């Protein structure tokens, strides 16, 4: 659920998610911004670090 994105800025607490690109995203706001940027190509692999 990245419906509320993109966002101009994100808070910066670390709670990691692992993208389908095998990149660890630092928090959900960073991940959703990257999903937007990918035009919906990027997906979530699992919660936590990759």
């Amino acid at each position: 659920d990245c419906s509320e994105y993109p966002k101009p800025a994100c808070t910066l607490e670390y709670r990691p998610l692992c993208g389908s690109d095998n990149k660890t995203y630092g928090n959900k706001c960073n991940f959703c911004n990257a999903v937007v940027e990918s035009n919906g190509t990027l997906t979530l692999s699992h919660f936590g670090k990759c």
Binding site: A9, C10, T11, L12, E13, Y14, R15, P16, Y25, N27
Partner: protein, 185 residues
């Protein structure tokens, strides 16, 4: 433990802002969005070394929180990494500043605007923030923004990253020091 070091809650990792005190009671400042919902803080990922418990939190609208040290042995340095901090000051446009955080370490840059409104969504709006061209990334929240020996702000949020460049907004530290009746040492 000093400004910029990692701090762990039950939900995630932030950075310690500044060590402060009131009389004999030692506390640390961090971001409000880190202290919201958090009770206990630890110094390691294993959550084996206690730091203390949240004493106050102001987020959204502002973005500052304060944690009361409950750990008697841990050194509570009045520094940012090795750097001495002796006073608090207000940011000005053009001021060269430095940030330290637990993900990216130390990065420098300048204040580019004051009193900015940042909308983090879901009704999480913060006002009166310092805008800079320093980068920051997840984990860096609550870390210090300083200028030589002067304490300026606490990391709130931003966009971009350290590899391509970013924009980061900080909560003015004087507002927090006044709110809690604490001082840098």
């Amino acid at each position: 433990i000093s400004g910029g070091d990692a701090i762990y809650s039950s939900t995630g990792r932030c950075s310690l802002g500044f060590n402060v005190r009131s009389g004999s009671t030692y506390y640390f400042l961090t971001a409000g969005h880190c202290t919201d919902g958090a009770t206990t803080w630890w110094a390691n990922s294993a959550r084996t070394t206690v730091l203390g418990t949240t004493s106050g939190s102001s987020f959204p609208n502002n973005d500052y929180g304060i944690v009361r040290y409950t750990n008697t042995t841990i050194p509570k340095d009045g520094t940012v990494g090795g750097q001495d901090i002796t006073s608090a000051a207000n940011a000005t446009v053009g001021m060269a500043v430095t940030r330290r955080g637990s993900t990216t370490g130390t990065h420098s840059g300048s204040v580019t605007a004051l009193n900015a409104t940042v909308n983090y969504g879901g009704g999480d709006v913060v006002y009166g923030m310092i805008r800079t061209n320093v980068c920051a990334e997840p984990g860096d929240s609550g870390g210090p923004l300083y200028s030589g020996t002067r304490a300026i702000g606490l990391t709130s949020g931003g966009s971009g990253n350290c590899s391509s460049g970013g924009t980061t907004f900080f909560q003015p530290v004087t507002e927090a020091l006044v709110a809690y009746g604490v001082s840098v040492y």
